[PDB]
């Protein structure tokens, strides 16, 4: 099972900027004139993965608490079949915890300036910042075709004035996963970055409301059944008599009353 997208792999050797990048043995990079060429100008990927075609069983699937392979989302996981990490999309079951990005890489304090491949653990982002090509208004058919495959979406926005998209996602795991796969692809290469808070008050309140709702759902399992019984009971009653009756009976507090009788 599995597909090894490239059996061979890639070996890195270079002399960019022709006359001497030197190479800084301490931190493995080159150093010379034209730093503007290094800031911008990222070159297109050689491969993109197709989900339905490539995905399959792995050695990780047998192990309960694994991660996904980073190279799978890049579409070059030379192992493929006998890969140690999962070769699927992140579902609601997969879970993970706070300081860990879906791919296993640890999170950090507070973002990059240019918004890198991992985000902060102090704020949560289900979103993605992009920079795309603009043929006509069939862009939205193209965007919705590709990004929908990587995960369950909440809402695709596509600003046509500036070729940019704020793509939120249903599961946070898909968002981290989605960014890597989309990034460095053609529809120049798409530019993928973590999203800053969207401008204006109303929109933020709308997002805050969604996050709060998400938290409430998470809490909801936790609360005591009698407390659970109540809010639900009150909504159904929308009852008074029942409440009164309950009050009379009452007259670790619940435990103490239980202990007495």
């Amino acid at each position: 099972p599995a597909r090894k997208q490239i059996e061979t792999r890639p070996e890195y050797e270079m002399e960019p900027e022709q006359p001497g990048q030197v190479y800084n043995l301490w931190y493995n990079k080159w150093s010379g004139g034209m730093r503007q060429d290094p800031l911008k100008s990222q070159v297109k990927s050689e491969t993109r993965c197709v989900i339905s075609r490539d995905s399959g069983y792995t050695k990780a699937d047998k192990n309960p608490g694994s991660f996904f392979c980073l190279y799978f989302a890049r579409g070059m996981c030379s192992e493929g079949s006998k890969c140690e990490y999962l070769h699927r999309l992140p579902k609601d079951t997969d879970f993970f915890n706070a300081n860990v990005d879906c791919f296993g890489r640890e999170k950090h304090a507070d973002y990059r300036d240019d918004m890198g491949g991992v985000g902060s653990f102090l704020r949560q982002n289900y979103t993605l910042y992009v920079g795309g090509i603009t043929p006509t208004d069939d862009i939205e058919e193209i965007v919705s075709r590709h990004f929908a495959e990587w995960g369950d979406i909440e809402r695709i926005r596509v600003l046509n004035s500036r070729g940019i998209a704020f793509i939120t996602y249903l599961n946070e795991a898909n968002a981290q996963f989605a960014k890597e796969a989309m990034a460095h692809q053609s529809l120049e290469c798409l530019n993928v970055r973590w999203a800053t808070t969207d401008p204006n008050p109303a929109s933020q309140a709308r997002n805050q409301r969604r996050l709060e709702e998400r938290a409430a759902n998470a809490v909801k399992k936790l609360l005591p059944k009698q407390f659970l019984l109540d809010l639900e009971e009150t909504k159904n009653g929308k009852x008074x008599x029942x409440x009164x009756x309950x009050x009379x009976x009452x007259x670790x507090x619940x435990x103490x009353x239980x202990x007495x009788x």
């Binding site: 030197v22 800084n24 043995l25 301490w26 931190y27 150093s31």
Partner: protein, 96 residues
């Protein structure tokens, strides 16, 4: 001449041998001369690069020299100190 002080034996080279980071073996002298002479070459290179001072290159004969030719602003960064140089010229001897 002082008459020597009473003391327990410290001995550095048997402390390092007691941690799990050093191992022991027996080889030829000239091998372990080259070993050092190299080790020191790198240990300076990695210092030169960590400072991002990457327009100077040490020759394999512990000889430091600029390539680019620098501004006065780029020279003040170079200005390696009384130690490093002493450490270097002690290597130049070991090499010979």
């Amino acid at each position: 001449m002082a008459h020597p002080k009473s003391h327990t034996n410290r001995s550095l080279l048997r402390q390092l041998k007691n941690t799990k980071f050093f191992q022991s073996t027996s080889i030829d002298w000239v091998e372990a001369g080259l070993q050092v002479c190299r080790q020191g070459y790198n240990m300076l290179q990695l210092l030169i690069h960590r400072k991002g001072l990457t327009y100077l290159h040490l020759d394999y004969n512990c000889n430091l020299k600029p390539t680019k030719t620098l501004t006065t602003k780029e020279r003040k960064k170079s200005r390696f100190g009384n130690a490093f140089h002493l450490m270097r010229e002690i290597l130049r001897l070991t090499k010979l």
